[PDB]
Amino acid sequence: LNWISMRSIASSKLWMLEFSAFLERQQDPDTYNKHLFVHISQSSPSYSDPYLETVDIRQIYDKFPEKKGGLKELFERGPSNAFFLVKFWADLNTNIDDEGSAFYGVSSQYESPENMIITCSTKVCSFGKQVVEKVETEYARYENGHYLYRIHRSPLCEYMINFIHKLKHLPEKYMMNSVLENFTILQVVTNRDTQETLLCIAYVFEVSASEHGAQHHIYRLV
Amino acid sequence: TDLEALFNSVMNPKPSSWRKKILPESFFKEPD
């Protein structure tokens, strides 16, 4: 698990296989629409692959929570190899919410060498301060010599959908990125029994320049 | 009666500005 933590989102103990945020509507009995705002699917890294580019963590303290229980505190305390920062270029081009209500949810997959119980805390942050915080506890399954966990079709909270709504109903893309400048999410994955921090990902956003598709870049905090 | 918005801008200090931070160049260049 350590050769991957230089090239993927993974610590010595947990590795995130996939991440997805999306909107889905069932147009027909046999037809359905799924649009992905953001997506990551790095489940087959290789030793040949280049290392991720490092980012100084001190630089990003402002856009994420501070004071007690915040990022400095965590990073200072938790295992260093577990901190990652991700920038997303969202793809907001979808119509599935015009009529016939859709479904908005997020999903992720993780892998572990060890069997554990993991607690995932996700916080949305406006101007650094915290607005909403969701917590989920996920349990393991043995597969292929290792352990697997997941957040499956988690329902996006109302605040979230609203935010997207206002954002999507906007005239120009820069007015979008501008708003996105001050919105960030911090997700921390902990080992419930022992309380160690296995993964800490900080998310920052921008909207895609391209007509279609989303993109991302991953950095390793230091 | 929500002319108040006009005020947020002179009242309400500005954010830290991402672009002025020390980061890798690739941070602002969306990929293909």
Author numbering:
A (entry chain A): 204 to 425
B (entry chain E): 26 to 57
Q: What does the primary publication say about this deposited structure?
A:
Formation of the YAP/TAZ-TEAD complex within the nucleus leads to transcription of growth-promoting and pro-survival genes, thus promoting malignancy.
All four molecules of TEAD adopt a globular structure similar to that seen in the previously solved YAP-TEAD structures. The structures of all four molecules of TAZ reveal two short helices with a short loop of 13 residues in between. The binding interfaces for helix α1 and helix α2 of TAZ and YAP to TEAD are virtually identical. The only difference lies in the position of the loop between helix α1 and helix α2. In the second binding mode, we observe two TAZ molecules straddling two TEAD molecules in a heterotetramer conformation. The two TEAD molecules are related by a two-fold symmetry and the two TAZ molecules criss-cross each other to bring the two TEAD molecules together. Instead, the loops of the two TAZ molecules cross each other in this conformation and a hydrogen bond is observed between Asn33 of each of the TAZ molecules.
